[PDB]
Amino acid sequence: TAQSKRSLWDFASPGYTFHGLHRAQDYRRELDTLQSLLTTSQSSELQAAAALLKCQQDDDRLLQIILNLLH
Amino acid sequence: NITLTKRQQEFLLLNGWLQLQCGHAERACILLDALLTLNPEHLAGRRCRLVALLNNNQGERAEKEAQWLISHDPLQAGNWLCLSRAQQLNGDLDKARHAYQHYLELKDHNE
Numbered sequence: 195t196a197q198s199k200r201s202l203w204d205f206a207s208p209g210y211t212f213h214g215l216h217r218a219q220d221y222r223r224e225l226d227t228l229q230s231l232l233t234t235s236q237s238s239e240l241q242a243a244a245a246l247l248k249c250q251q252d253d254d255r256l257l258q259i260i261l262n263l264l265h
Numbered sequence: 266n267i268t269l270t271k272r273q274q275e276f277l278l279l280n281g282w283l284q285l286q287c288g289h290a291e292r293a294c295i296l297l298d299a300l301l302t303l304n305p306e307h308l309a310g311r312r313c314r315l316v317a318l319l320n321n322n323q324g325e326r327a328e329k330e331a332q333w334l335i336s337h338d339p340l341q342a343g344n345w346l347c348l349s350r351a352q353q354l355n356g357d358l359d360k361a362r363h364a365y366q367h368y369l370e371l372k373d374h375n376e
Contacts, residue, residue, distance in 0.1 A: 202350060205343035206316035208282055208309045212275075224276045232299065235267055243277075243299035246292060 225251060269303050278310050285313065290321040308337065315347050324354035342372035 214220055225247055232244035269277075277300035285293035297314040300307055311334055318327040331348035338344065345368035353361035 198346060198350070201343070201346060202316055202319070205346065206282070206285070206313050208278055208313065211283075212279055220272070221276075224272055228273050228276060231267060231273070237302060239295070239298050239302055240267070242295050246295055 267303055269300070274300060274304055274307060274310075278307070278313065281310070281317070282313050285317050285320070290317055293317045294321055308334070312343070312347075315351075319347075319350055319354065322354075324351045327351035328355060340371055342368050345371060 212221065229244045229247040229251065232240045232247070235241060235244070277296050281293045281296040281300070284296065294314060294317050297310050297317060300310045301314060304310070311330060315327055315330040315334070318324075318330060328348065328351040331344055331351055334341070334344040335348065345364050349361045349364035349368060352358075352364060
């Protein structure tokens with residue numbers, strides 16, 4: 195049922211999102227801190243999460259260069 | 266030993282939830298698995314991953330997660346809807362109907 199699926203998505207929703215007066219600075223700060231924190235772990239699952247965060251942190255830096263070239 | 270601050274827990278939860286909306290079920294599960302490895306009692310993260318498990322096609326895992334949530338709050342209707350959906354994905358239709366009846370008995374019919 196579509197209604198049950200919507201009720202499921204409503205149940206999964208945390209009901210809020212990123213907040214604060216400087217969520218742009220706070221996101222890059224927590225991202226950089228968390229990726230170095232989880233890298234020190236021995237669990238493969240935590241290492242996978244750290245590697246995923248590092249990838250997007252640097253894949254975006256590649257896209258920023260493209261945007262500058264494209265103005 | 267690693268301990269997550271509240272902001273770091275929030276970071277993983279919200280990035281996982283937003284990636285799940287972006288159709289990146291893999292990214293969501295990796296992030297939410299990491300959160301729930303370090304904070305196993307993070308209820309909102311458990312709910313988000315359970316629905317993500319239902320979308321990465323991991324029904325047997327989803328059933329155990331729903332049973333985990335039910336034992337923490339047996340009166341929360343949404344836990345029983347999650348159990349019903351995992352069980353019908355796993356082919357146990359008759360059990361999925363009993364779980365759905367529990368969902369109806371507990372849900373807020375005003376929502």
